[PDB]
Amino acid sequence: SSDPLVVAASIIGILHLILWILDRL
Amino acid sequence: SSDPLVVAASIIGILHLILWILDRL
Amino acid sequence: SSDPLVVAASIIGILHLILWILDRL
Amino acid sequence: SSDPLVVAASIIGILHLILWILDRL
């Protein structure tokens, strides 16, 4: 639904950002 | 409006993150 | 404040995502 | 909790975006 989709997209973005920061370190 | 713009930006960010994750895989 | 900071960070992230998508195209 | 985690992920994403923009400049 409109609430579970926005949540899922947010979690995906956060995971990608954390991975990128770990690569730069 | 102030509600549709923040939603659109969020969807754009999520799509970009998904694409990046697919490239890394 | 706690409301203007989260908004500013969100706009910054959206602009960065749009720029990245334009580079990939 | 479900409120502190979403906030933390958001801050992490914003910091990563700012760093990327600084590198492009």
Swiss-Prot record, chains A, B, C, D:
Origin: domain of life: Viruses
Sites annotated Essential for channel activity, possibly by being protonated during channel activation, and by forming the channel gate and the selective filter: 16
Site annotation Seems to be involved in pH gating: residues: 20
Transmembrane segments: 2-22
Compartment(s) where it occurs, according to its Swiss-Prot or TrEMBL record: Virion membrane; Host apical cell membrane
Subunit structure and binding partners: Homotetramer; composed of two disulfide-linked dimers held together by non-covalent interactions. May interact with matrix protein 1.
Domain statement: Cytoplasmic tail plays an important role in virion assembly and morphogenesis.
Extra remark: When the channel is activated, one or more imidazole moieties of His-16 probably become bi-protonated.
Function recorded in the entry: Forms a proton-selective ion channel that is necessary for the efficient release of the viral genome during virus entry. After attaching to the cell surface, the virion enters the cell by endocytosis. Acidification of the endosome triggers M2 ion channel activity.
Family, similarity comment: Belongs to the influenza viruses matrix protein M2 family.
Name of the protein in its database record: Matrix protein 2
Organism for this UniProt entry: Influenza A virus (strain A/USSR/90/1977 H1N1)
Gene field: M
Portion of the parent chain present: 22 to 46 of 97
